[PDB]
Design a protein around this ligand. Structure first.
Ligand SMILES: [Mg+2]
Ligand SMILES: [Mg+2]
Lengths: 122, 164, 138, 258
RNA sequence: CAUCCGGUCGAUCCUGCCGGAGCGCGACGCUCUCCCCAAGGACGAAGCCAUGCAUGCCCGCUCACCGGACGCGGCGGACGGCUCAGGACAACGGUUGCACCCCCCGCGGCGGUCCUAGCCGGACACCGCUGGCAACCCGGCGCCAAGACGUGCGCG
RNA sequence: AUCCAAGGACGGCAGCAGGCGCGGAACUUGCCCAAUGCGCGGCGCGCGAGGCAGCGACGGGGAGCGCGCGAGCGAGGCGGGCCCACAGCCCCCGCCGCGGAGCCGAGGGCAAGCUGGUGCCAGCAGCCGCGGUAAUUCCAGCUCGGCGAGCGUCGCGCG
């Protein structure tokens, strides 16, 4: 199992959003990193292990090189305020509500617009 | 509308005006055999590229030597040719370009460069191994037979490390 | 010479060419409009009609059919190419009819024939000739 | 014939010097009305997203602007489509970065970091002297700013130094031969030179001839000639002193950087 | 990326046309192993349309129910999307001008108003009671709010 | 053109899907506001604009149906990643493993020839022409030629 190296590039400080910009390059010649979770540690020591988000990740032809982006937040709350919901759902942070079809929502909206005065019955 | 409408596209080859010509058929079959060409579209592609280079060289040559545009474009074209290995290093005058031939283009294909290094028995064997991803350029593996290698990359071609 | 050549004579040359380009038969046919109105196909590659009558230095009787175009209601004559293909054509049947090699003029020793049958009842005639498709639905 | 004003902007119809990518999307931001017009400005979001890379999307830029983290001439602006223009002040206190918006030799907007000694003012070009209500004299500038009761010695096409804190003139530069200028439009945008001739044609445009420091000479109309001090520039300028290289020299630079 | 070939005669040289040889746009036929990109009811029917969707948001005004409904008010709906009927010194393209012009938002200024102001007056909407009509639609009585309406203190 | 409890009421898809008619000719009555933008707004809502997916031999680009005396490699199948608003697809890691060519033509223009039938009949033939007992041209078998996942036919434009 050949070792795996993670580097840090394009380091930028973003105090406005209370995080750091990132581009992660992971080298696993002749092998595959298990996934992003097992590689969080390398980026963490290079730069709390739960305040990092990896979202960009593409493996080039041949499998030798894989590159991506990370996002390290100063605090947990900053992550909560500044983060797309689907990213949180992909991460193990919050719980996804059951989806609802937008077609039924539009039907309800039109039916409600049809009624007058108090239209809460339907 | 859809953003996909603004994508460009173009053809890459030219067909002969006279299809049935015995010497042409003989020469094309000969070239296909020496360089192991899959079909006759590759020859048309090579002819297309050669025609483009020749037209650029003609247009540049029609002008005076001390013309800023002539110097600019000739330098660019010569640098490209030297980097790609089509033209020899010792040639730096624009005249030598017009005498080029498609054989020079063919000789820089991946199959040819691995065969001349003795790493393959024949062009057909080279193609068979290339399709089976057993070759690598620098640190990356290329499975396209028509891939064109550059002069600085000729010595960095080897067998794939992971190849069995 | 026999052509005007002065530096300020563009108008005369323009009008001369305009007038004299009408003497070419092909150009007249293409850009006069009479052919467009006369052509039963009305500029289309091929049309659809209905069969109404099967009929017939080389001395070789040829098999053809009379057609009535649906979109135009006029009558024309069409020829059935292959060998023994007349049996596949029945009276009062829908056909698809195209042109011959030459656009308008007659082809070969057939007198006054300029149209070809290619599809019958929604199946290619040539395909039926090779038994690729079959007419058991009809 | 549209029944009213336009609110959208297709990406392909946008100005070239913005450098928007063809396949980025169908639409482009439409700047709102303000100090600078559509063809001599640039939206704030482009700077905040496609240049400094501090934001990756529209929403991030909107959040940042709402938090009032960006100042434009000392006044916080919350509009993602606010137009930014020439000789503006762009200071972000939370990261101690202050820039002045200028033109590069290639003819594009640039951010030149500045010092505090010169970041409390801006230079304005006066384009109009008119009498307002009650006969009170006025003046207007290229950034849509009107001043009352100005000095009579100030005429058209001059340059004015106004303090941002208050908004009062302190000194002005006359338009004359031998004064360093900067070109703000046309084929010669971003060049620096000195006026050498002024030729006026009755009933039509006035032509200005200036010489570059190296010795080059070029022509432009008076509508886009901006005085930036006497002999020497009053403000900071990009690293290159308004010298446009030739194609060959630029190709050599590109090859060196590669 | 400067090319021609077969056909009038017992044979030959010309004029002259017929046909072939290339590319592109569509339709038809036969056939189709893998991947990437990608057009798609325009073609003398701008012919006719079941069914669903395509324009909302909110600072102002809470004695509603437990503050969220609803309603008044404000901004927007004149942008976007579809098609090419009409129209031939017109539309349109480049080049001028308004010392014959109008202009919301936004930015910057400016802000002197002749003859109860510890803060004025009356209404409707929602809602309660009472009703017509197959549906669509509304009626009559009744207390209440305003960044709504009306009046208006003020250095011509 | 629609409803009517006959006195009355009511509509404008050349918007997105979809249906009829017409024609030689042209797709799902799908998911989403996550990206680009617009509208109104403070920690967001809405958008058939737009995006994603589906049908799709209009069309364009890249690989293959073997190489050699043994191995190897794909397509494909089953799982894990990555991506995705959610799902795919590409790409990567493991185990097992379907190698499938058609369309035109062989007198000339124009590259490519032997048997059996038919007998100016049937048929071929863009043009010249073939066919009335060897048919180098029809119908079939063998062999061969061109392009090739494409080939051929019809109409138009340029040459
Ligand atoms: Mg008064
Ligand atoms: Mg409508």
């Amino acid at each position: 199992m050949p070792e795996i190296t993670v580097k840090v590039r394009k380091v930028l400080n973003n105090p406005l959003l209370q995080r750091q910009q990132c581009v992660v390059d992971v080298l696993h010649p002749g092998c595959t990193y298990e996934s992003k979770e097992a590689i969080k540690a390398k980026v963490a020591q290079q730069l709390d292990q739960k305040n990092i988000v990896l979202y960009g990740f593409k493996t080039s032809f041949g499998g030798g090189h894989t590159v991506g982006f990370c996002n390290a937040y100063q605090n947990m709350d900053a992550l909560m305020k500044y983060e797309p919901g689907f990213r949180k759902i992909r991460c193990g942070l919050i719980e996804a509500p059951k989806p609802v079809s937008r077609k039924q929502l539009k039907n309800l909206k039109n039916r409600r617009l049809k009624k007058r005065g108090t239209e809460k019955a339907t | 509308p859809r953003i996909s409408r603004h994508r460009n596209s173009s053809k890459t080859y030219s067909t002969p005006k006279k299809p049935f010509t015995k010497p042409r058929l003989d020469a094309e079959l000969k070239l296909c055999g020496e360089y192991g060409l899959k079909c006759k579209r590759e020859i048309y592609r090579a002819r297309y590229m050669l025609a483009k280079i020749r037209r650029t060289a003609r247009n540049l040559l029609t002008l005076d030597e001390n013309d800023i545009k002539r110097r600019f474009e000739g330098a660019a074209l010569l640098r490209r040719l030297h980097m790609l290995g089509i033209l020899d290093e010792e040639k730096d005058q624009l005249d030598y370009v017009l005498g080029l031939r498609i054989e020079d283009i063919f000789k820089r294909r991946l199959q040819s460069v691995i065969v001349e290094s003795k790493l393959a028995k024949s062009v057909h064997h080279a193609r068979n191994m290339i399709k089976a991803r057993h070759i690598s350029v620098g640190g990356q593996i290329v499975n396209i037979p028509s891939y064109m290698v550059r002069i600085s990359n000729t010595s960095r071609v080897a067998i794939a490390d992971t190849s069995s | 010479m026999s052509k005007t050549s002065g530096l300020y004579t563009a108008r005369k040359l323009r009008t001369v060419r305009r007038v004299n380009r009408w003497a070419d038969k092909k150009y007249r046919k293409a850009h006069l409009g009479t052919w467009l109105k006369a052509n039963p196909l009305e500029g289309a590659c091929m049309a659809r009609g209905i069969v109404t009558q099967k009929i017939g230095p080389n001395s070789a009787v040829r098999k053809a059919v009379r057609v009535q175009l649906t979109k135009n209601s006029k009558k024309i004559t069409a020829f059935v190419p292959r060998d023994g293909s007349i049996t596949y054509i029945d009276n009062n049947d829908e056909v698809l009819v195209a042109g011959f090699g030459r656009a308008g003029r007659a082809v070969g020793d057939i007198p006054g024939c300029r149209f070809k049958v290619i599809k019958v009842a929604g199946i290619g005639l040539l395909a039926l000739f090779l038994r690729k498709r079959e007419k058991r639905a009809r | 014939m549209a029944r009213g004003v336009r609110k959208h902007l297709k990406r392909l119809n946008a100005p070239k010097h913005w450098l928007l990518d063809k396949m980025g999307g169908i639409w482009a931001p439409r700047p709102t009305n303000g100090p600078h017009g559509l063809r001599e400005c640039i939206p704030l979001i482009l700077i905040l997203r496609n240049r400094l890379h501090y934001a990756n999307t529209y929403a991030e830029t909107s959040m940042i602007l709402q938090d009032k983290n960006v100042l434009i001439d000392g006044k916080p602006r919350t509009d993602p489509t606010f137009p930014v223009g020439f000789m503006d002040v762009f200071e972000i206190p939370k990261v101690h970065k202050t820039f002045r918006v200028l033109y590069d030799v290639k003819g594009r907007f640039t951010l030149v970091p500045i010092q505090s000694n010169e970041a409390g003012f801006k230079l304005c070009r006066v384009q109009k002297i008119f009498l307002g209500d009650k006969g009170m004299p006025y003046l207007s500038t290229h950034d849509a700013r009107t001043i009352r009761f100005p000095h009579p010695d100030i005429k058209t096409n001059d340059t004015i130094k106004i303090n941002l804190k208050t908004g009062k003139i302190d000194e002005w530069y006359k338009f004359d031969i031998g004064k360093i200028v900067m070109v703000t439009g046309g084929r010669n945008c971003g060049r620096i030179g000195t006026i050498q001739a002024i030729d006026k044609h009755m009933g039509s445009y006035t032509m200005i001839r200036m010489k570059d420091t190296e010795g080059t000479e070029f022509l432009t109309r008076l509508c886009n000639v901006f005085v930036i001090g006497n002999d020497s520039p009053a403000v900071a300028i990009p690293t290159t002193k308004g010298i446009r290289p030739d194609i060959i020299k630029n190709r050599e630079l590109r090859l060196r950087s590669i």
